């Protein structure tokens, strides 16, 4: 859990790399077909949910 929140998916495939969580969500959103802009703009709302 600690690795996932801080390093995203980097720890699984190699030495862990630190990335901001907000940024990690943007990357993850990209994977599902939703653009990065939606996450930052709705970051307050997404966090609440």
């Amino acid at each position: 859990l600690a690795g996932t929140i801080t390093s995203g998916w980097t720890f699984g495939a190699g030495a862990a790399l630190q990335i901001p969580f907000a940024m990690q969500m943007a990357y993850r959103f990209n994977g599902i077909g939703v653009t990065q802009n939606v996450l930052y703009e709705n970051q307050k709302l997404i966090a609440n949910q």
Binding site: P20, N37, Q43
Partner: peptide
């Protein structure tokens, strides 16, 4: 360039290179 500069929590004022405009001129 989607969005306006009030909705992001983390931001910086770095200048965009904007390479395309000079060529058009």
């Amino acid at each position: 360039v989607s969005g306006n500069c009030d909705v992001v929590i983390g931001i910086v004022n770095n200048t965009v290179y904007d390479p395309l405009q000079p060529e058009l001129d």
